[PDB]
RNA sequence: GGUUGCGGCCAUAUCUACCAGAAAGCACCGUUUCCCGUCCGAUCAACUGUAGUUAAGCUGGUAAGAGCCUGACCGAGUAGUGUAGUGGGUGACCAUACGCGAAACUCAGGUGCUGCAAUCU
């Protein structure tokens, strides 16, 4: 899984004599590949409608590419997750160039700060904030100030050799 | 279509309350010599369909009826459960993956169908 990928997954109940041409439900799924995306689709349709993989059918799966992969966006993400003692909703903000890597950042963030495994997370929503001043988290808001520039003090250079003859510097 | 005799399934047929029922049938209904049974022709027996009555039985209809029956992407793919992991959690327990999948509930509809023989504006 070099990264996540976003798939649109469209499926339906199996057609019957009573109801030919059912309703065609669709979701956007962040998954490492096609098989997981289809599995996640059925898992989530399990919780919304009376249907399972055996009574249903996957009409379409299509990868969804970022419209502008090279534009930095501020994403607001609503997640539902299970902690060890209950279920909680939260909203986080991630700044990056694509939805898939923003969601990838989000899973890493949920694992790091809340020990929430991919098993225990529901991506309720991902949406770009098209306007500044609608951004609310200070950790992403600090990066939107005009003419932003910071140094990177204490540069640590990687040495290929085991022994150095120079007693190095961390300048930058 | 009504009714009677014998039924099949055994409430969609049961229960409550209340209204209808032409004809025929069924019924209630008249009598106690006889065969029989009673504390008691109430029941059971016999006899006349004669004296009468649809009052009841019976049948059908009504009920935002009770019950019952059928369905529902109703609740609910919930509860539960087969399988898996060197999954989570101190534990109690829980999540996930591949499968199966209820009951209550909530609406909706319905309230006997039918076989054989005989008979009837
Ligand atoms: Mg008498
Ligand atoms: Mg094992």
């Amino acid at each position: 899984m070099a990264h996540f990928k976003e798939y649109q997954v469209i499926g339906r109940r199996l057609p019957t004599e009573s109801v030919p041409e059912p309703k065609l439900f669709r979701m956007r799924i962040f998954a490492s590949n096609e098989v997981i995306a289809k599995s996640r689709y059925w898992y989530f349709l399990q919780k919304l409608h009376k249907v399972k993989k055996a009574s249903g059918e996957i009409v379409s799966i299509n990868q969804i590419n970022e419209a502008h992969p090279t534009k930095v966006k501020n994403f607001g993400v609503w997640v539902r997750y299970d902690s060890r003692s209950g279920t909680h909703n939260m909203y986080k903000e991630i700044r990056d160039v694509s939805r898939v890597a923003a969601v990838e950042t989000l899973y890493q963030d949920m694992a790091a700060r809340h020990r929430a495994r991919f098993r225990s997370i529901h991506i309720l929503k991902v949406a770009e904030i098209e306007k500044t001043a609608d951004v609310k988290r200070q950790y992403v808001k600090q990066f939107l100030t005009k003419d932003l520039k910071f140094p990177l003090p204490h540069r640590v250079q990687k040495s290929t050799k085991t022994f150095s003859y120079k007693r190095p510097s961390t300048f930058y």
Side-chain angles (χ1 to χ4, degrees), chain A residues 7-24:
Chain A
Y7 305 89
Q8 80 159 357
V9 191
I10 310 181
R12 53 172 199 165
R13 302 179 194 81
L14 287 180
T16 60
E17 182 75 27
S18 64
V19 189
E21 182 65 26
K23 305 307 286 187
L24 285 186

Side-chain angles (χ1 to χ4, degrees), chain A residues 129-171:
Chain A
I129 297 95
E130 299 100 7
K131 293 182 183 293
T132 304
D134 268 350
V135 165
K136 323 194 297 190
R137 294 298 183 255
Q138 165 90 345
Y139 54 82
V140 62
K141 203 196 297 183
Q142 64 180 344
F143 282 94
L144 319 179
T145 55
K146 169 69 178 313
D147 285 346
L148 167 66
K149 61 194 57 146
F150 51 92
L152 296 193
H154 193 88
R155 166 165 68 144
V156 182
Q157 293 179 356
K158 207 174 176 206
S159 179
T160 76
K161 287 170 125 187
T162 175
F163 294 126
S164 165
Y165 299 82
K166 218 166 73 164
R167 181 71 74 179
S169 52
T170 68
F171 72 97

Side-chain angles (χ1 to χ4, degrees), chain A residues 75-88:
Chain A
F75 286 106
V77 191
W78 295 255
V79 295
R80 169 195 168 139
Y81 70 101
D82 305 341
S83 84
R84 298 164 186 154
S85 53
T87 312
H88 315 275

Side-chain angles (χ1 to χ4, degrees), chain A residues 6-140:
Chain A
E6 194 169 3
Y7 305 89
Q8 80 159 357
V9 191
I10 310 181
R12 53 172 199 165
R13 302 179 194 81
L14 287 180
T16 60
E17 182 75 27
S18 64
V19 189
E21 182 65 26
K23 305 307 286 187
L24 285 186
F25 298 97
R26 167 194 186 261
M27 314 165 78
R28 295 171 76 137
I29 300 301
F30 286 103
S32 178
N33 52 63
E34 289 275 71
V35 186
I36 295 166
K38 282 178 203 165
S39 167
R40 288 270 87 190
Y41 173 89
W42 283 121
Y43 158 89
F44 278 123
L45 267 292
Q46 293 293 346
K47 301 162 149 262
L48 313 179
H49 286 98
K50 180 65 70 66
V51 63
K52 47 199 197 159
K53 181 153 153 84
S55 297
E57 167 192 274
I58 297 292
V59 181
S60 193
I61 182 158
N62 310 91
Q63 189 170 348
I64 299 172
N65 299 330
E66 190 56 70
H68 310 100
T70 56
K71 189 187 98 84
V72 178
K73 306 167 262 292
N74 323 302
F75 286 106
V77 191
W78 295 255
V79 295
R80 169 195 168 139
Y81 70 101
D82 305 341
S83 84
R84 298 164 186 154
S85 53
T87 312
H88 315 275
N89 306 307
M90 64 184 73
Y91 162 74
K92 309 186 88 74
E93 265 164 2
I94 301 166
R95 185 171 159 86
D96 185 43
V97 293
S98 83
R99 287 158 61 78
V100 290
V103 160
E104 190 277 331
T105 291
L106 166 76
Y107 278 113
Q108 305 289 103
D109 180 297
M110 291 305 280
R113 301 196 147 108
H114 311 281
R115 320 299 180 172
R117 275 78 160 170
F118 176 96
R119 163 172 71 247
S120 311
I121 294 164
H122 295 172
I123 315 298
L124 309 171
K125 183 183 212 273
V126 174
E128 79 286 5
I129 297 95
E130 299 100 7
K131 293 182 183 293
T132 304
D134 268 350
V135 165
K136 323 194 297 190
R137 294 298 183 255
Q138 165 90 345
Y139 54 82
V140 62

